[PDB]
């Protein structure tokens, strides 16, 4: 089998470069157009995706550091990623996310219904492995282990999608962009047209390991037992578990901290969301003997006037989760360490992390005004994709027109159409929020737009 | 003397934390309000200060890595900073820069003429050591070595300023914000009101070392020999030399790369700026035997249609400077390694780096439209500072009103005034470009502004 430091394309380093291949991955990523676009992309609307990706990289390094010295896990030290690989994986995890976030993701998936759908994490793999113009046709040409580390869902769209969930009540009067977004969310997956990339990631493993590692589950009873739902992938690589843990800690605490600052989560919300289960903080305070973890003391410090009393509690909770990162084996039958080993929190810490994250989804993610803005990004992307798809040679830039022509060669009929719509999907998804707004305004908004 | 890992305020780590003090500095910085503000701050206007600071951190780590293995410099390996310290120093170097960049810096220095002036690098030290609300009154409370690493100019404003350079031809008809900005630029320095911070940084050194390390020079003949000019500090710490080298590589190549993309630097500009001295590339190509360094070959790749041919040359030039980082001793009489040792490029590489950077200043920094926008930031900040200074209790937020009251206590007369204007200067300088624009529009622009 192939090495983990192997790339799809041959790009050997000069003898002047003792940097390991994982550092070369970090260097290419930071100097890449896909990573620099994280500035003009916000996840909530304040906090940009670049800042979130840096905080996630910091948390992941702290996780890897904590594990690399805890001798209870000394048996697994050799399989931990290094500082450069965990950073590059953490800094790349939100690269594929489209403009306007979930509003744009639902939009592109709805437009690509007959052509493979769209999902952000799949586009992250698509950009990293092919789209980014660091190479001709191999993206940034990352190492096998880095590609595996960003593959959060190693199962294809077709193998996971349940198109019965897309079913809608007919409405002759509704425009094409007007629908319930929750019923058009894609499965978390990789795109079928990128199977070659996934083949490379998995050529360094035994095929029985691949079958066990790509196992899925059928979730049941989201509201009713017969409600149709997509299938979920079940397992991620070891490095991916570390990044996914850091990614959730930031969403649970750092987006919570921003919610306190903006006033979207009050102490009344806190004490009502924790009206029961004050032991989520208190019982932990007893076991670890940390008076700072007392529910009433940490509540006063979180909702304190002095900003140094809040950041001290946020950082205390950030440190509490990093110090409670355990590494177990997943219920996959895999014997490879990178496929069988998982990093996660202590069960009592995860209960507290989730319960803080649930208050964030309730007051921030599902705020009426936040959702109204997501729908507008849905309308904008749909209306932009339609127009770019109706006459792509009139509107698209010349290099994008070349890819669309190139994608259709050797293909005819419906396969040619899906391959060319994929290029348009990669063009729109690779837009920044302001670039997509300007592109919308040049095409539709009455008095806006300039030829330069 | 005191240790380099010592902080002004006592904030010892728990036994659960094996992170070194320099990693704790990196962790606090990333989760700090001052570092997160780098998203909404651009240096040129595209590339944000956050992205520039990440690229600088990457270059610095590559420099430290290259030096930590080159055995010609093995005698100095023990004095190199670690990965966390060089990152925190690189990620913090542009924290103090005000809104609208040099336009805002000239603005604040002009307003603070009688009250100590303003300079960005000084505010970086002021934020890191006192202003940031991570602690009560000690900022992020960084280690002594990190504070030293961001102290680019270890000489005070008063000791360097030449107020004859501020002299202006009288103009009764000109508004207060209308002046030549070049004649009101401050010296590169630290603010006199922050001498206590600088005292702490230097208590870990012998006083003779401090006198030699804080030596200055009087530059002569900017245009004419008798043209008045500020004095310059002469020496930086070892870690600061590494950060300052990375900071200049990014400005010389990464801002050059953006200039190619936006069309602000043409191949005609390149071949005319290099009409002579093609040997800046070619002679290096002969010594290192690198055909890619041929002037005509690298020109075709830099100004190529394929974006992978440009990024390959930019990264080749980024790698060429990192591989030519030498560490010598400065002409300071210092015997401490952190004060006597400097990191810099090979003389022939610096000639090429500077000559590329000169084309960036000519076509980008001094573009007429870029300068027109800088002046507008100058007008906006001046008009905002004046109004905030005329009635600070009517306009400033309550916490900022508390600091201004607190800064004036124990003082009367002109010293009280300068101390309270310093708080207003810290408030404006700590604004983001959009926050300062909204604050300007609430106060002056006819139909804009909301009470929320
Ligand atoms: Mg994320
Ligand atoms: Mg800089």
Author numbering:
A (entry chain A), B (entry chain A): 1 to 45, 53 to 459
Task: Show passages lifted from the paper.
We cloned representative dNTPase-NTase systems from Salmonella enterica SA20044414 and Escherichia coli H5, as well as a control dGTPase protein from Shewanella putrefaciens CN-32 (SpdGTPase) previously demonstrated to inhibit phage, and tested the ability of these systems to defend against phage infection. In contrast, SpdGTPase strongly defended against phage T7 but only weakly against phage T5 suggesting a differential ability of dNTPase-NTase systems to protect against phage infection. To further understand the architectural organization of anti-phage defense dNTPase proteins we next determined a 2.7 Å X-ray crystal structure of SpdGTPase. Salmonella CloA and SpdGTPase have low ~33% overall amino-acid homology but adopt the same overall HD fold and share all major structural features. However, unlike the octameric assembly of CloA, alterations in the SpdGTPase multimerization interface result in assembly of a hexameric complex. Similar to CloA, the core unit of SpdGTPase is an anti-parallel dimer formed through hydrophobic interactions throughout the HD domain. Differences in CloA and SpdGTPase overall complex architecture result from changes in the CloA C-terminal α-helical bundle where lengthening of helices α19 and α22 causes the CloA dimeric units to interlock at an angle that is ~30° wider and multimerize as an octameric assembly. CloA and SpdGTPase share near identical catalytic and substrate nucleotide binding site residues suggesting that CloA likely also functions as a dGTPase. We tested enzyme function in vitro and observed that SpdGTPase is alone sufficient to catalyze rapid dGTP hydrolysis.
